[PDB]
Amino acid sequence: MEVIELNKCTSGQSFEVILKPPSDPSLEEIQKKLEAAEERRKYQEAELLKHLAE
């Protein structure tokens, strides 16, 4: 039993009760990865249209 930091208003009230105490990638790197994918996509398609030409 230890209630602390009781804040009351009109809408309601808030508090804290304690039982016991204690004992990113850059915009470039994104585009690099996104195009790398599209380039693997285009190559896969190119080799298909090459295989379909044959």
Binding site: S11, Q13, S14, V17, L19, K20, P22, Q44
Partner: protein
């Protein structure tokens, strides 16, 4: 007053979005045309509700929201719905071809076409904000757009809004309502990519919500409508602190401070009671003691797991209705001796409590009954890690044989990104064990 921009990605995100803004509107007394008679400050104001709603000179309360999907069907029902007048056409963004339950299509192939347009539309809302707090992102783990596009957006938002908090509402997949075999793949891939860009993430297991609907609301076979009405009440209880006067969880940074000590372990467990059937002509009204105790019953959790076989890093009780401090302290005091609530040694065994005297609003002609008092407990417990383990095992079963991997490699991804994403989840599982278990 600090503004919050909601973003709804994929079907799941968009449909859960509708359920929320419908519920928010009723809670704030905002009519479906957007008019709010109770608001005496026409055009603007720094009221609590303005954090989620901008105002026009005509007195229309417009959600700070962007709906994005790579298919027009779901967002077309927002454009032609009951709350069509609520949103600007610029807020509702659609492609023509969806991600076909493929993270790769959502993140790379289709995602890359619309990402710049979406950020441009998000920036239009951001420019209306006097002091933007952050973002609440709603999406599925299973969907192609939900998984794929979100992780791309969350990356770009980190770049374009370096200092702004980002909260998730992630719909964890369940086979009772799941529409794709590869949802484990999409789930792991997005969780890995988003992990560094998400400050706090509320997972919702469809299976949990489905079972609660069947068990508590006596619904033979729940639809998304059924799940979404219940999910909206949980989301509303969490966001109530931002939209209403109060002291606890008044801004998005307070969420991570209160619930997230370890940046990677940022998945709180939400437990909500009471969920009672509108059909039930007579029902006993549950005391503060009874609803508080119910938050430690795995049946009432948004993700089914056993907190008794884990450890707590933080525990947060969010009450609505006829609740006074004396009753809550008493209820917790009694629960402490009975229940098994072990906190980690470096955190204090405490409960941060917030009370809103307005009892939970229910959409008329709904499933949920009107109750005098309800509670939503947000607890950061190392038991939620079970959710990862289940998902991670299904990933391993399929990926062992490389089943369905050609669909992802076909859209430009490498087998590298799979094993890379899985090794990050293997690390997250180990992290949750290190914090949680002694033996």
């Amino acid at each position: 007053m600090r503004e919050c921009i909601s973003i709804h990605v994929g079907q799941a995100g968009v449909q859960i979005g509708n359920a929320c803004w419908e519920l928010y509107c009723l809670e704030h007394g905002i009519q479906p045309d957007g008019q709010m008679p109770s608001d005496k400050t026409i055009g603007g104001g720094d009221d609590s509700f303005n954090t989620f709603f901008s105002e026009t000179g005509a007195g229309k309360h417009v959600p700070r929201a962007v709906f994005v999907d790579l298919e027009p069907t779901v967002i077309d029902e927002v454009r032609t719905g009951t709350y069509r007048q609520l949103f600007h056409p610029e807020q509702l963004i659609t492609g023509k071809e969806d991600a076909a339950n493929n993270y790769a299509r959502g993140h790379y192939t289709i995602g890359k076409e619309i990402i710049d347009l979406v950020l441009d539309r998000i920036r239009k809302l951001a420019d209306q904000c006097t002091g933007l707090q952050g973002f609440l992102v709603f999406h599925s783990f299973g969907g192609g757009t939900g998984s794929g596009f979100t992780s791309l957006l969350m990356e770009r938002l980190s770049v374009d809004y370096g200092k702004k908090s980002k909260l998730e509402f992630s719909i964890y997949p369940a086979p009772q309502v799941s529409t794709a075999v590869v949802e484990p793949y999409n789930s792991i891939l997005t969780t890995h990519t988003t992990l560094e860009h998400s400050d706090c993430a509320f997972m919702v297991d469809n299976e949990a919500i489905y079972d609660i609907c069947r068990r508590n609301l006596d619904i033979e076979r729940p639809t998304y409508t059924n799940l979404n009405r219940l999910i909206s009440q949980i989301v509303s209880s969490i966001t109530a602190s931002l939209r209403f006067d109060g002291a606890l969880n008044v801004d998005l940074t307070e969420f991570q401070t209160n619930l997230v000590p370890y940046p990677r372990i940022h998945f709180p467990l939400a437990t909500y009671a009471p969920v009672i059937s509108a059909e039930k002509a007579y029902h006993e009204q549950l005391s503060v003691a009874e609803i508080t105790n119910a938050c430690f019953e795995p049946a009432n959790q948004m993700v089914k797991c056993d907190p008794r076989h884990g450890k707590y890093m933080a525990c947060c009780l969010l009450y609505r209705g006829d609740v006074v401090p004396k009753d809550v302290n008493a209820a917790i005091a009694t629960i402490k001796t009975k229940r098994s609530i072990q906190f980690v040694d470096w955190c204090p065994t405490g409960f941060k409590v917030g009370i809103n005297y307005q009892p939970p609003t229910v959409v008329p002609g709904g499933d949920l009954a009107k109750v005098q008092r309800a509670v939503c407990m947000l607890s950061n417990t190392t038991a939620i890690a079970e959710a990862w383990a289940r998902l991670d095992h299904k990933f391993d079963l399929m990926y062992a044989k490389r089943a369905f991997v050609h669909w992802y490699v076909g859209e430009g991804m490498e087998e590298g990104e799979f094993s890379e994403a899985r090794e990050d989840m293997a690390a997250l599982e180990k992290d949750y064990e290190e914090v949680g278990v002694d033996s």
